[PDB]
Each structure stands twice: as structure tokens, then as C-alpha cells.
Amino acid sequence: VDAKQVKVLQLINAYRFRGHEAAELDPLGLWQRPTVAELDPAFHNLTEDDFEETFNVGSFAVGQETMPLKDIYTALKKTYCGSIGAEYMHMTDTEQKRWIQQRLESVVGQPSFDKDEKRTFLAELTAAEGLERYLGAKFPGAKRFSLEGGDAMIPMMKELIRHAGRSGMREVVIGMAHRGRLNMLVNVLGKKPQDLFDEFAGKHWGTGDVKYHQGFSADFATPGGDVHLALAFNPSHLEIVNPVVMGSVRARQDRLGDDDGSKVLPITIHGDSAIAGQGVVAETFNMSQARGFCVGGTVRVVVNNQVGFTTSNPRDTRSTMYCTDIAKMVQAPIFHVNADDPEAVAFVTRIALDYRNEFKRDVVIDLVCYRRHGHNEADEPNATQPLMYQKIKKHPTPRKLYADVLIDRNECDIETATQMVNEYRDALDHGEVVVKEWRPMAYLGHEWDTPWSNTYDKQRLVELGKRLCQYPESHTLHSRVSKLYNDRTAMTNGEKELDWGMAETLAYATLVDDGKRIRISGQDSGRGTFFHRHAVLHNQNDASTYVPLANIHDKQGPFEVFDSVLSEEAVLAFEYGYATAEPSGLTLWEAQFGDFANGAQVVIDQFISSGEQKWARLCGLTMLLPHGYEGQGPEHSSARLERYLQLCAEQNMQVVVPSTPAQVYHMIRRQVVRPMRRPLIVMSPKSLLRHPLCTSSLDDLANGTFMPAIPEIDELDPAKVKRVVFCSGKVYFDLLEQRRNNEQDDVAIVRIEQLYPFPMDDVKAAIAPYVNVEDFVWCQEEPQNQGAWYCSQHNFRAAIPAGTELKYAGRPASASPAVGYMSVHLKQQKALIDDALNV
Amino acid sequence: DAKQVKVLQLINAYRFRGHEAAELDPLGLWQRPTVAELDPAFHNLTEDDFEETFNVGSFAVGQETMPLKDIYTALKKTYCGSIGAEYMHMTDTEQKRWIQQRLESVVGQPSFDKDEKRTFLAELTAAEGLERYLGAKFPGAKRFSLEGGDAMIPMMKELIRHAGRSGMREVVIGMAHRGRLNMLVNVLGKKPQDLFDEFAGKWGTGDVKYHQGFSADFATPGGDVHLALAFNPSHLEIVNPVVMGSVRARQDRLGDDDGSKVLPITIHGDSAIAGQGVVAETFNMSQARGFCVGGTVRVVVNNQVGFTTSNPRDTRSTMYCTDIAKMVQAPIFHVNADDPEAVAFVTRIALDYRNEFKRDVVIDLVCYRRHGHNEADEPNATQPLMYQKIKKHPTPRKLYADVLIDRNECDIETATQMVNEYRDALDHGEVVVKEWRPMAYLGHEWDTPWSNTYDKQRLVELGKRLCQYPESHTLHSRVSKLYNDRTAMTNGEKELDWGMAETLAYATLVDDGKRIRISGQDSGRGTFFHRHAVLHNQNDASTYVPLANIHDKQGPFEVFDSVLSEEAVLAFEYGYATAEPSGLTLWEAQFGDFANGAQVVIDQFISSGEQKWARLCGLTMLLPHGYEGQGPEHSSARLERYLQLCAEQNMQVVVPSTPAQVYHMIRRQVVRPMRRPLIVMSPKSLLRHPLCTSSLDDLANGTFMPAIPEIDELDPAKVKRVVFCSGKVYFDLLEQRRNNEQDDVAIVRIEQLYPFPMDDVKAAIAPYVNVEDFVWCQEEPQNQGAWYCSQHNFRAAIPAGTELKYAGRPASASPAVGYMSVHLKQQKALIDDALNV
Numbered sequence A: 001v002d003a004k005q006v007k008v009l010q011l012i013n014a015y016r017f018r019g020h021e022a023a024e025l026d027p028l029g030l031w032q033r034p035t036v037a038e039l040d041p042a043f044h045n046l047t048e049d050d051f052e053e054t055f056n057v058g059s060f061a062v063g064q065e066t067m068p069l070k071d072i073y074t075a076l077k078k079t080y081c082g083s084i085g086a087e088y089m090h091m092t093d094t095e096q097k098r099w100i101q102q103r104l105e106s107v108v109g110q111p112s113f114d115k116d117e118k119r120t121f122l123a124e125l126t127a128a129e130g131l132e133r134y135l136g137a138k139f140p141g142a143k144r145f146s147l148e149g150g151d152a153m154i155p156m157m158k159e160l161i162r163h164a165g166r167s168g169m170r171e172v173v174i175g176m177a178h179r180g181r182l183n184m185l186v187n188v189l190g191k192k193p194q195d196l197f198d199e200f201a202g203k204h205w206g207t208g209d210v211k212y213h214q215g216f217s218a219d220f221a222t223p224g225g226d227v228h229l230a231l232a233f234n235p236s237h238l239e240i241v242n243p244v245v246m247g248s249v250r251a252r253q254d255r256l257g258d259d260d261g262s263k264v265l266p267i268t269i270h271g272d273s274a275i276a277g278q279g280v281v282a283e284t285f286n287m288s289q290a291r292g293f294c295v296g297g298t299v300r301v302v303v304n305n306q307v308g309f310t311t312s313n314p315r316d317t318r319s320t321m322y323c324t325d326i327a328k329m330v331q332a333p334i335f336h337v338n339a340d341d342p343e344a345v346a347f348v349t350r351i352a353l354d355y356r357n358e359f360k361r362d363v364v365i366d367l368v369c370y371r372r373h374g375h376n377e378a379d380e381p382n383a384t385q386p387l388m389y390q391k392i393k394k395h396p397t398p399r400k401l402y403a404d405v406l407i408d409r410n411e412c413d414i415e416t417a418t419q420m421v422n423e424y425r426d427a428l429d430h431g432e433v434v435v436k437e438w439r440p441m442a443y444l445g446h447e448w449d450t451p452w453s454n455t456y457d458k459q460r461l462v463e464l465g466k467r468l469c470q471y472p473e474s475h476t477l478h479s480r481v482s483k484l485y486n487d488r489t490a491m492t493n494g495e496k497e498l499d500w501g502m503a504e505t506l507a508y509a510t511l512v513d514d515g516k517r518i519r520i521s522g523q524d525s526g527r528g529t530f531f532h533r534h535a536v537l538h539n540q541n542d543a544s545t546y547v548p549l550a551n552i553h554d555k556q557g558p559f560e561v562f563d564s565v566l567s568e569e570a571v572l573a574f575e576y577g578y579a580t581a582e583p584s585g586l587t588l589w590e591a592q593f594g595d596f597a598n599g600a601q602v603v604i605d606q607f608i609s610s611g612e613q614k615w616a617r618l619c620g621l622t623m624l625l626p627h628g629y630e631g632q633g634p635e636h637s638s639a640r641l642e643r644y645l646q647l648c649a650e651q652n653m654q655v656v657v658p659s660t661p662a663q664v665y666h667m668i669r670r671q672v673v674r675p676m677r678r679p680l681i682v683m684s685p686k687s688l689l690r691h692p693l694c695t696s697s698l699d700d701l702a703n704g705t706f707m708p709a710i711p712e713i714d715e716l717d718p719a720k721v722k723r724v725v726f727c728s729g730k731v732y733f734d735l736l737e738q739r740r741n742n743e744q745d746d747v748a749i750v751r752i753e754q755l756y757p758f759p760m761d762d763v764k765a766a767i768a769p770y771v772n773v774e775d776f777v778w779c780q781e782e783p784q785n786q787g788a789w790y791c792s793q794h795n796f797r798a799a800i801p802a803g804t805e806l807k808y809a810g811r812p813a814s815a816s817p818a819v820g821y822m823s824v825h826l827k828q829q830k831a832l833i834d835d836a837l838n839v
Numbered sequence B: 001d002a003k004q005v006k007v008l009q010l011i012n013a014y015r016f017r018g019h020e021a022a023e024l025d026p027l028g029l030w031q032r033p034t035v036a037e038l039d040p041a042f043h044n045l046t047e048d049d050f051e052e053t054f055n056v057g058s059f060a061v062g063q064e065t066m067p068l069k070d071i072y073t074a075l076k077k078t079y080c081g082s083i084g085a086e087y088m089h090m091t092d093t094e095q096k097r098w099i100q101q102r103l104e105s106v107v108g109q110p111s112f113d114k115d116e117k118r119t120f121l122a123e124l125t126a127a128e129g130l131e132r133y134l135g136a137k138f139p140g141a142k143r144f145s146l147e148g149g150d151a152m153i154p155m156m157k158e159l160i161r162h163a164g165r166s167g168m169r170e171v172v173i174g175m176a177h178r179g180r181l182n183m184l185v186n187v188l189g190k191k192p193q194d195l196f197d198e199f200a201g202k203w204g205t206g207d208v209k210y211h212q213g214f215s216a217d218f219a220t221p222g223g224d225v226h227l228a229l230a231f232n233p234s235h236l237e238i239v240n241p242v243v244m245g246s247v248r249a250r251q252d253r254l255g256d257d258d259g260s261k262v263l264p265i266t267i268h269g270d271s272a273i274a275g276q277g278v279v280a281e282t283f284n285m286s287q288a289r290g291f292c293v294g295g296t297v298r299v300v301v302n303n304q305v306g307f308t309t310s311n312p313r314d315t316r317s318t319m320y321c322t323d324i325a326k327m328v329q330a331p332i333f334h335v336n337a338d339d340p341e342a343v344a345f346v347t348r349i350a351l352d353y354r355n356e357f358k359r360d361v362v363i364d365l366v367c368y369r370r371h372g373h374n375e376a377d378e379p380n381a382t383q384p385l386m387y388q389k390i391k392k393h394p395t396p397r398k399l400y401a402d403v404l405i406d407r408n409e410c411d412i413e414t415a416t417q418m419v420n421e422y423r424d425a426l427d428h429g430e431v432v433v434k435e436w437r438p439m440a441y442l443g444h445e446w447d448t449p450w451s452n453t454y455d456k457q458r459l460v461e462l463g464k465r466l467c468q469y470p471e472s473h474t475l476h477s478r479v480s481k482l483y484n485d486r487t488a489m490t491n492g493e494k495e496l497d498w499g500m501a502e503t504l505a506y507a508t509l510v511d512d513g514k515r516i517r518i519s520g521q522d523s524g525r526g527t528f529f530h531r532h533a534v535l536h537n538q539n540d541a542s543t544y545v546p547l548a549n550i551h552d553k554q555g556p557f558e559v560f561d562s563v564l565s566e567e568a569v570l571a572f573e574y575g576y577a578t579a580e581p582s583g584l585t586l587w588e589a590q591f592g593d594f595a596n597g598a599q600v601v602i603d604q605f606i607s608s609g610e611q612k613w614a615r616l617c618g619l620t621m622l623l624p625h626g627y628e629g630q631g632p633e634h635s636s637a638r639l640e641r642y643l644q645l646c647a648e649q650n651m652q653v654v655v656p657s658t659p660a661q662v663y664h665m666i667r668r669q670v671v672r673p674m675r676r677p678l679i680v681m682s683p684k685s686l687l688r689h690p691l692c693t694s695s696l697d698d699l700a701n702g703t704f705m706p707a708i709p710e711i712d713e714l715d716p717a718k719v720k721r722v723v724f725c726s727g728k729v730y731f732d733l734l735e736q737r738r739n740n741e742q743d744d745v746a747i748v749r750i751e752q753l754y755p756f757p758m759d760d761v762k763a764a765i766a767p768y769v770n771v772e773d774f775v776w777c778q779e780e781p782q783n784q785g786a787w788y789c790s791q792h793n794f795r796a797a798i799p800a801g802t803e804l805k806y807a808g809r810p811a812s813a814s815p816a817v818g819y820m821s822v823h824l825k826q827q828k829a830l831i832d833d834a835l836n837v
Ligand SMILES: Cc1ncc(C[n+]2csc(CCOP(=O)(O)OP(=O)(O)O)c2C)c(N)n1
Pocket: A179, A236, A237, A238, A270, A271, A272, A273, A274, A275, A303, A305, A307, A308, A309, A375, B521, B564, B566, B590, B591, B594, B597
């Protein structure tokens, strides 16, 4: 009934919502943060006399039901306006808001750490500073992307790993960028400092990568036992590694049966400028609770040194007060903490991990710090941030402030802190591992033409097909789906040749029949964009689903196909991380059309095509890219085959253009059964899914094999052949039908199904019979500046007899991939067919 | 008075969470989880309290005191009806009170005059009639029907009417396939007969009908307004940054400093806006200086399905697809699309909010998709219950007509007259937009002559002004050193470096009154410490920009340190350059290796917009490029990819090698009357190379050379081999040939690789009548660079008796090696191989 008691409650609520806006977060003290009137008691009409009266605390979780207002006011400022700026009241979940209030408000901001723990934090701050000054002394001017100014991340990361083992987690996977990367390698993951000193000195499998992109694996002793540690390889492109780490841990969580993600912990580290500006951050946040990509939530740490290279003005880097405001899209709590207060850092770190393990949701730690040097060690920061570095020049390091605090508290002494600095310098001189909790951990690279088991028992293959066509009798299907499954029933009885959708389905069935995993993701991949797959049967009565590939037999390998979020960059990065972590199974990503894969171009350029040469990473990821010129316009015709062929080199990737249902069946099986794990780029057909001539028999599947090149199929006279037409994909069936309708027999048509690595022997074998050949033609639907022409012509010339010429037949070069009009498309298609067939 | 505190907390609970119980789904399939805070029993309010009067606090219903039973009814009408208001997450108290006054005073029930209700019904009739008409006349054809979201047509026209009502001059729209033909015919005023011709089959290679843009004038109560609908590709959401660049280009030209004259509108799909990362990149630019346009009205056509995907657990991680907007604290108005008056009422609020606070605002139009994703697709295979409900769901026109008839605000004959009269207008084939009004070459070939010369005395006066700065504006000593060098360059005591000639090139354009807009990461100083367009005071943090201080009549100059984004920023500058081609619009990647993050803008806009949409764009892209031993991501701008994209004169690919060449190259992009994209391989070490210098006369009296002939005085008859090359590899070849005292080898630069300058190249090669072979030298791996794409051009230029040979790095999966020592060995090998006869 008291009115001021209600005013006290609104004062508490105002600090929970907005206390972070006045918190002393900047270590440099340069921030002049705008005043918030609600934090002032006078805003709530509380006077000096009210401060002496006792009040009930309401839901304020300080640990006593009643206390005087002067003590309530002191409690709020210490809880929410000290070194910790807690941002959590935007969340809608009441239980989670109560959970955070119990952690912070009972502590009243002041964490209690053991003298052993306080010494470990100081020793870890000593390791962070000492390694960085050591590298600056020994290699002056060399780029190292120093952690200095953000030294608290080293105790934070080791406290995160220790708390992860303390909570029974088995593995931790980390994605990070350049900032503090060498510090994380030496002082957390346990890389030998002498090995790091060798890399600065010029001592080095493949073409390699820069020192601050390297990953690492190690075991790490924790109170709860040894934990495996993994630090990802990444390119210079920022933030893209985050989805890749999400895929790796999900592949780990799948293998371990960790359905709630409590055994494998994902940690991503971000820069303040990068996390605000890169769109892949939002795409990954949008996948955090998708059933096909969720990993139980990620702990996300921003090393917020308040500058991006030469850009520090908030009006240039972002549109909001905090770089972490993107996290609000998924209502993640955000803990801003001053980096000069390591105990607040470790205290916020335990809370953020406990929140992640409790509610299985993303959580963000904003480590507000500074950059002691320029963006790199050879760059001048004063030219563009004069005031910031005039303050940094007179700012003591976090180790020195923390040691001074412990000494004034008589929780440490000056000689112990001095011993840490000098002893760590000697340990770097010794060159051995300086991580006391480090522990030792307790191929698939064969050439593409390695022999593999292509055959399958034909009766088992029919038995698998009969099981694929079965579904519960109460699970009513839509009539168009019942029709397609009836066609699939006729294919299993030999009454019809198999179409693309059936041969693709049997390929998955044989792999789960062998216990191999299959994970498919992509937009509308459950049904298929072109209505050909229908891996998921939707009941017409309720909305229940049934997946025949998940019901082959007990003890089968797992099968999953996910309708992916409407994203390409983060999703393709996720599946690359999944396939690299678990190469044994099939991992396939399907673009809706191949034209849209260029939105994930960074994953294609910096991971898929180059990860083996740069990091010795094998990845067997399969990419289905629908492709084909059928008159549907520039964005529904070309998967940009020319770009993938341009990326091919040093056996890095496979580029394949299957033309038969049997070819895609063996192609898929070869990607698992053959002991090689390199990316498989596939030009998926569209009209060929229903082309009457694009069919295969059960004998082609059971006893056939993937053909890198397909010889002439029609009854020709080898001596009468005047021209051989090379081609790939659906253009073959256009050439084949026109050549038959012309009753032509002086023209041979040979398909090159695998465009890279180039199958020279198979191509020469297909061309041997025509001893009277005069010229060779490469026919393609693509414009002359696209497709295989400019990139693969040298391979075609090396295969043909020396006396013959190679000629081009195809669409003219064009700036746009395809014409906007169907009528123009059909006339262009007929011209390239007639030109290829015209002796 | 304890219940009085409970009543205030009940009011606050509806402001925060009333949207979670609102009747938003037209189909009523949503079983929304119960919210305990909305229950009065949760606040310990019983039946006895409901009869007692209470003070409403800040509840803006128009009376300070009310019985609890009326307050409870008022809250449900305000926050749990057709409108789900999400605004309490905002921190700004003035903006929260502003929204509360709009919604709570109305108590949910907007008041429209009988004329306005008739306009909404007629516009719903136009939306439905055109879509059923196209289905009857072209069955099965892809049209991406608006049906189920018909309220967007009255919403857009009310947005434009309200925009002119508040004095705005221009509105620019970016949207996707959904309702695109409806927007063209029923809002932008495209002739229905012209649309019917395109369904029946018919400047360039063209594009599909639902990518077309349009321009028109639009009568509003406040006067005529210009309307623009953007061209866009199939790639979703990418058009949004492009529209942001167009409106900023309009606001810059008009002096619309606060963005109140030009209104940007973006339309989104529910699945696309949640999943595409360019959305967040654009929201992060909404208040950054150099990209802000005063806020955008953003409309989501939320039909609760994406193609075959409707399960929320597969499309997003949150209850709402619009939750991304919370990163910038935008209010979000969810509205049932079957309630057009709630739609129009929310529409006026969102525009009034945008004009008042100059911030982004989102309208979540909760609707359904009447047909499959396209008209030839079966939705029931994957969404059975949703379409079993849609099959028995009346259309929005029918529901609104019934409502007006039950209110006696309309009659069945008027609603029937609208349906049949609109069908007759489509048969007539003329414009059906009653407020439509009529509106009140940069493609010449690349070799067109242009004014390359400049007064040398004028150029020296420009350079001396560039070196001036206030004497109190203390500079960092390294910046004072570089500016002292530029002073000596203006006095003729030193040859020009890359940074000075680039700066003088900008100086001549603003000197002629042309605009210059530069954006890119760290572009003010330059990533490589060469530009320093912005001088930062060492005492305070104040800035000074010499290029903005040439003279009082100069054209505007701006260089912005861009956000850490490539996709949205390059899409923004493409929209800026296309909207205002007169000036220079330049985007600088930090390294060219990072431009692949904006590959969609490169593939679908820059390289193809002319052939597809007849749009000219003179955007310049500085992409730092060069093999200097810094690793795979700091060596290659992927020149081979840009050359692969070249065709039909679409783009210019240039690799300047001298400070004079970049000066003329820059000037040519404005002075020459052509506006096609300029792809530039920017140097890095050449910014400080002692041999990479030019004189003031090279700027004043020189010109851009597509090819540069041999510069050393050689005997033409002694040359046994010609080495073609581009970029910094030339300076490596030149020094090695000089150290060898070699004179049988000529080194010719091909500065412009596309369009290929055959005549300039052949002129450089004519003197060497005794040549035996030609070499293409490149630092790039053989599968990269110009080799595979440009070799046919090299063969066509050389005499028939000679062979073309390759000298360069071996093909590699990664652009460059990790180690500097391996890099120097590879560099020495390709240099020695190119020069070794
Ligand atoms: C996608 C991408 N664009 C540009 C760059 C170039 N780049 C490297 S670091 C950097 C600044 C990063 O700023 P911040 O996120 O604050 O990281 P910090 O160095 O300050 O720790 C930029 C623009 C890059 N590496 N990746």
C-alpha cells in the first residue's frame, strides 16, 4: 500500500533494463556515455529521507526480503553499473530472466574467487602479456596481431574450458580470427613456443597458409577430467568460420548421440567491427534453433577493442550503441564486461556457459577492451586515432592493474607477481609447452581413379526398392505422390526403366544399408525443387511425416534430409564443416538452382576448393547444383560451370555432369565407397528428371560403374564416322535425337561425364575406333565465355589425333548467363545443335 | 491501492506481450501458446476488482480513470486484435510514448471516411481481379500471385498517398516476385495489355517479366509524386541495399539532408528476410553516415510459407521472421491481412514514425499463399492442412465487402459493380491506375575520344591547395612527411607517386563541379597508408579534407570509411552510381581477395545489368591486387573471374601500372561519355615503388594508354622476343632485363585487358620486325589471371609465323603460397623464364 515501496520497485526494474548503459565498461575511460534519467532516484521521486527507511526488495534477489533504500541503491549500482553491463531484460522467457537475476543480484556484482583462482588469473594474464612482449622483442615489426589490451581473453578461454570439463562436457571447438590467435595457440591450446618461433624465423606439406590461420588439437586437463580441444583453420575472410564450426560440432554431436548438445561445446570469437557488418553472423544466429543445424547454443565472445583497423567512429562502423545488438534477433543475453577486471570476466564467463548449458541457447560475452598497438604491428594508429592512443600510451596493462588490486587486498604479494613475469620469460626461452593443463590426445586422400566396389547384389537392390515404396497404410499420400510411388513400384518390378529420382534414391538406400550416414540439406530438399525426390511423405489427414529411407532396416546408417533455411553462405559453410569432421558418410548440399550458389562464393573459394592445399583438410562434401539451359532465364539456367573449372587445380575438386540415372547412382556411391574425400561438384539436371530417354535399367545399377566418359551408344560404323562431338549433360539428348531424326551416321557423340580431373584414358578409349576422323567438336549449351570451353579446351586438344582440329559449337559469348525470352532460347538451342552436327 | 499497482502491471504486460496473443493468422491455424502475464488472475485481480474504478497511468485511451473491466477490454482491443504491436523493446521513451498515443487512443478501431473505405475495397478488387484474370487467360503460367496477400495493394497506394500527403517528392520501391505483376499494373500503372503481350511471348538479351522495373508519376492528396520500382534479379533481398544507394543518390542531389523528400520502401518475403544475411548488413547501414537515408519502411509479405517449407523449426530460430529488425530497435507492426483497415491504419503509423524519427520501421503483413509457390506447383504434397484450410477460405475482397455491407457502409451492388467494371478495364487494356500520371545517352563505345588534357598550371594550383591545411591542425609526423613530399611534387622537385596522381585526378573532377563519392574499408587513409584524404588533428580529434576545399564552386567530395561489409556496400554503390551517373562513384575493397563476398552484386548487377535491364552503371571498383608473398587472401583479386564475366562490352578490366595511368583512368571514367563498370586491379607495393612514378606533364598532356610500348631505348631490329604483361610484374621484368644488359627482349604492358585494345597492342608490336616468339608473363597461377581467358586475343595480335608462350606461376588450388620464401623463389623463376631467350 506504500507508494514509495512501489517507487523502489521501479528503480530496481530501471537498473535491470538500462543499468548497462551507465556501466563503467571502457577500460580507457574515454567513453562519455549519455546519462539515463531512470537510473537516478530523483527520477522516481526518492529523497534523502527515503534512503534511510527500510523497504521490501520485491523480486530483487539480494538474499534478504527487506533492506534500507540506501543499501538497495548501493546494491543496484554495484550489480548493474560496475564492470559488468548485463543486457537480458529484452528476453521474453520469464524463467530465463529469473535465472540471470539470481546469478547477478545475489552476488551484488562482487564475485568470490579462491586465492588459488586469483593467482591463476594473474598467471594467465602474465602469460598473455609475456608472450606478446616476447614476440615483439624477438621479431620487431613482424605481423602478429597482438592480443595486448585484451589480455583477459586468455584467462576467460581457459576458465571456459575448465568450466566445460567441470560441467561434464567432453569436447570444445573454437572458431576465431587473427586477434589473439597466436596467444590462443601457445597459451591455451598448448602449441610449442619454439615451433612458433621457428615459423617467424622462416621454417616450414601443401602450399600452406599464414601463421595466424592455423588450427590445433590438444587435450586439456580440467577438474572434471581431460577435454578435447579443437581450434579451426580459417581464411582471412572474417566470421565465415563461425558456421563452419557449427557444422563440425553438430557432426560430433550426431556421432556421440549428444541430442541436446551437452557433450560438445561450440565457442566462436569475433571482432567488434566484423560481427556488426558481416551478414553471415545473422544467418548463423537464424540457424541456432533450426532442427537441422542447432547445436545446443553457442558461447560467442567479442574481443571489442573499440576500433576496426583505422575505423573507430561508431557512426561509421554500425547503427547502434553496441556491436553485439545483432544477437537480439534471437533474444540472446549479452554480457558486457570491462576487460581490466578479470574477475568480472571470469564471473561473466561462468554465467554465460551455465546459461548455455541450462537453456541450450546462444549467449554473447562483450569483452570491452582496447588494441595496444596498431591494427597490425607495422601500422601507425595515431594518424587516425590520436586521442585513443594518447590515452593508451599512459594506460597500464591488465596484468599490472590486477596485480596491484591483489596486493592492496593482501591476496598476493609483489614478489609472487614478479616471479610470474620472469619465470614465464624463462619458459619461453626453454621453448617447451607452457600450458600446464595441456595433455597429448588419447587417410582418404587416394587419387580419383582408385578402384572401388561399384557392384551391388541385384536382388538386394530390388528388395531395397520395394522397401522404399512401402509406407503405412494409414499414412494417406497426395494423389500426385501416390502416382510417383506407383511408378517407383513399377520400376522395382522391371516394368519400367528407372528415372533419375529412383536411381538417386537407391543410391542413398545402399549406403544406409551399409550403415553409412547420409545428411542432406538444401532449400526444399525433402520433396525436391523439381518434384522428383519426395524423400519425406506428408500425411494428408494430419501433418505427420514418414521417411522411407529412414526405415530400410534396423541397424541401418542414419538418414536425414533437412529443408534448409533460406541461406546459402552459412549453410554451405555448415555442411563443409560437417563433412570435414565426419568424412565416413555422405554429406550433400543442394542449391535450389545452381545460379544461387554464388551467394556462398567465399565458402567455395576459401574452403572447398583450397582447404586441402592450405590446411591439409580433406572434405568429401557433395554439391548438387541444378543446371541446364531450358529457357527459364539468367538465374535459372547456369550453375556457372566455368567458375568451378577455373578453380580446379592440383586434384583439389571433382566436377561432374551426369547424364543418366545410372551415372548419378554410381556417382553418389563412389563418393562414399571409394576411399577419397575431395569435394564433388555436380551439375544437377532439371528437365532430365522426366526426359523419356534419360533412364537406366536395374542391370545398369547393380553391375555398372560410374563412367568418366560415355562412348557412342548407337549402332555406328566406326570407319564411316566423319566427326566426333564432345559434350556433357542434357545437350547430349538434344544432339542424340536430332542425329537420329536426321538418320545421320557419320557423326559420333561422346560424353565427358567427369570434367575434372580430366579422364584422358577414358576419352582416348572412346575415340579410338574412329580411325577416319577429320575434326572434333565441343558442343555446349553454355555461352562461349562460360561452360567448359575456355577452361577445358587444352584437355580436349591433348586427346585428339594430331592431324585433326577441335571446333566449337555452342551459344555466343554473353554478359548475361541466359536470355530472358523463351522464343530466343529455342532458336539459339536449334542453331548450336545444327552447327555441331553439320559435317 | 495495491490493486492499482496490479492494474498498471497488467497494462504494461499487454504493451510488451499482447502481440503474442493477437489474432494475426488469417487462416486461424496458429495455436499460439498462452501468455500467463495477459491473464488478470496472474496479477491477482479478481472479479470484484473488475467493477472498481482505477487510474490508467500512461494508458492513452483518452480518460485518466476507468473501471478495470473497461481497461481490460481496451487492452484486448488495442493489442490482441488484428494488430500485433512490438515496440516496448525500444529504449527511447519518446518513441514509445509516440506509438502508445497512436494505438491506445484509437483503442484498436481506426476511423476511415466512407470514401476511404470505398478506395480500399476497390483496391482489393483490383488486386484479386487482375490475378484471377491472368489465371483464366494464361493457365499454368508462372505469375507468383499476390492472392491471399491482397491487402498489400491498398497498403502500397496508401503509403504513396500518405507520402505525398506529408510533402515527400519521391518514393522508391524494392521488392521480389510476390505480387510483382500486381504492383506493376495496379500501383505503378503499367498497361495491362503490355503485360498480356509479355505472357504471349516477345535493347538486349532481356529478363523475366517479374524482374521489370517501372517509373511513373502518382497523384496524391498532397500533389504528384514520382514512383520508381527497381529492377532486380532472382536473388532475394540483394535489391534492398541497391535501393538504399539509389535513394541516397537522390537525397544527395536534392539536398535532402534529413531524408524527408525521398521515401525508400523495401518489400520482403518471410522466409527470405529471416535467412539472407544481406538483410542484417543493410540494417547495420541504416544509421551509418554515408549510407543513411532517413530510415526505410520495410514490408514483409508473410504468407507463412517458403516454397515447400512452412515449419517454423526449419525456416528460422524465433517466433517472428521480423526479429532481425530488433538489432536496430525498429518497431514491428504485425497485422492480419484479412483486415485492410487495420492494414491501412498500421501503414499510416509506420510512415509517420519513419518521418518523425528517421528510423527503420517494419510492417509484418500476416497473410497466406492462395496457390502453390508458383502456379504450376502442388502445395498439398508438403502443406496439406494449410491448403485444406485455404480451399475453404474466402478472399480478402469478399470479407471486407461483407463487413462494409453489414455496417451499411457499402452495398452488394457497389461491390459487384467494382468486380465487373475492373474486368472490363482489363479487357480494354489501358492503364487502370486512376492516379497514374505521365512523368513531367551514356553508352558510347569505349574508344570514344575524350578530353584527356588539363592545364598544367591549373594542375599545379590544385596540388598546392591539396597540400594546404590549417596551421593549427597538427598532423601526425608521418602524415606531415607525406604531405611535405606532395608539396615537393607540386614544385617539380619530385616525380609523382600513386597517391598524389590519384588525388590530383579527384581534384580535377570536383574542380569541374563533378561529384565524387568513395566508400570502402579504411578508404579515408587507405589500407596501405597512401591516400590520407582525411587529415586527423593530433590535439583534438577533428578532421580536415583537402579535396573538399578546392574552391567554393567545386563539386561535392566524400570518402567514407565503410562498414565491415562487402555485399551490401557494393550493392549500395551500384545503386548510387546507376541513379547518379554524372560523377565518380568508387568502391574500394581492402584487398581484392575479399570482393568475392559481394559476388552476387558482381554477377547479377554489375556484369549483367545492361544486357538484362538496359541499365548503365559507371561504378568503379578498386581491388588491391598483386603477388607480394602475403598469402592466399592478400595476393589475388581473382582477375580471371572478372575476365570470364566480360562479354558484349559489359565491363572494363584495367590493370594500371603507373601513377599517370591511374590518373587518366580515373578521369576517363567521368570525362568520357560512357558509363560501364570499371574493374581495377589496384597496386600495393607499387604505391612505394621507386620506378613507379610520373611527372606533372604526364598528367597534363598524357592520356590513358590501353597499351604502353617499350620505354627503354632499344634497337627494334635486335628484339628477338616480346613479353606481354600487366601490373607490377612489369617492374620486376624491367629491372631483371636491365641488370642482364639484355636488348633482344621487349616488354609491353597491356593496361586494359577488356575490351581488348587490338590496335593499340598491334601498334606497340609493329617495330619488332625480327621477332621470333611472344611471351605472356603473369604473376598469377596459370589457371588464374589473364591466361585462359585472354590468350586468343594475344594470338590474334601477333604475326602468324610466331608462337605464343607462357611464363608464370604453375596452376594451383590456392591463389598463393603461405610462405614468403617459396614466393620469392616462384617469382624469380617466372621472371627468369620470361626473359630467357
Ligand atoms: C570479409 C572480410 N572483409 C575485409 C577483411 C579485411 N580486414 C581484416 S581485419 C579487418 C578489420 C577487422 O576489425 P575487427 O572486427 O574490429 O577486428 P580487430 O582487428 O579489431 O580485432 C578488415 C576489414 C577481411 N579480413 N574479411
